[PDB]
């Protein structure tokens, strides 16, 4: 009956560590990817239904969908992150599995371009993330029935928003939902390889830490940096 998301869930503000370094810097790429990962998880924690599920269930959910959540965030933040510049630099350090990583990079580029071409807005991205977060398809979850109802509310709220905001674009909702399968064509293992493993990082292991961290000290350090 009541809504899954509020207008508060539209805000998704990534702070990059600095302007693009002159030369390939793996630390800058991973720091930027890690800020996006932290923001995606801190955004999920802001949803009342997510908090209501409890720590066991909501850790299992993120462990199952983090790569899809993270990739929607890559598409949303592509301009802010200069993602096109970052992917080019990885392809070159690569070219100077190998061919798996290349196909993955190509899939990520095509996904990010498909979302830009549709002008996906902040509301549409929040609902798309909620639809991937509350997917009942994953074999781990315990409480399929309740997660299914949360996913159905996200779908209904996205349709109402698209009908109210883009009334003349009859086919927009269908166009946006047919982007979601593209997220599952991208291996979480390769995302981890491309943006994290190197700096030695299992995302599955650190997810519980990110979900429990106090965000005040973290956000102060991010915002108070040069």
């Amino acid at each position: 009956e009541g809504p899954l998301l509020s207008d508060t869930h539209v805000t998704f503000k990534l702070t990059m560590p600095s302007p693009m370094p002159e030369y390939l810097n793996v630390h800058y790429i991973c720091e930027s990817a890690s800020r996006l990962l932290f923001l995606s998880m801190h955004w999920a924690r802001s949803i009342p239904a997510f908090q209501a599920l409890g720590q066991d269930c909501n850790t299992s959910l993120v462990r199952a969908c983090w790569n899809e959540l993270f990739t929607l965030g890559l598409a949303q933040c592509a301009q802010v992150m200069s993602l096109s510049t970052i992917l080019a630099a990885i392809v070159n350090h690569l070219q100077n599995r190998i061919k798996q990583v290349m196909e993955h990079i190509w899939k990520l580029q095509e996904f990010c371009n498909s979302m830009a071409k549709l002008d996906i807005d902040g509301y549409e991205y929040a609902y798309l993330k909620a639809i991937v977060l509350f997917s009942p398809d994953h074999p781990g979850l315990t409480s399929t029935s309740q997660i299914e109802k949360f996913q159905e509310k996200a779908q209904m709220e996205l349709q109402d928003y698209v009908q109210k905001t883009y009334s003349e674009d009859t086919y927009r909702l269908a166009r946006i939902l047919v982007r979601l399968p593209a997220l599952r064509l991208m291996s979480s293992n390769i995302t981890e390889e491309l943006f994290f493993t190197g700096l030695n990082v299992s995302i599955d292991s650190i997810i519980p830490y990110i979900l429990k961290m106090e965000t005040a000290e973290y956000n102060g350090q991010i915002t108070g940096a040069s």
């Binding site: 560590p17 800058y28 890690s34 990962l37 932290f38 990082v201 830490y209 040069s226």
Partner: peptide, 23 residues
């Protein structure tokens, strides 16, 4: 202007804690 590796420093702490706790 200059990067502060805030998120990397948290991840380094999380990794270190998880390795102690398991294996």
């Amino acid at each position: 202007q200059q990067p502060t590796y805030v998120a990397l420093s948290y991840i380094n702490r999380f990794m270190t804690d998880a390795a102690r706790r398991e294996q």
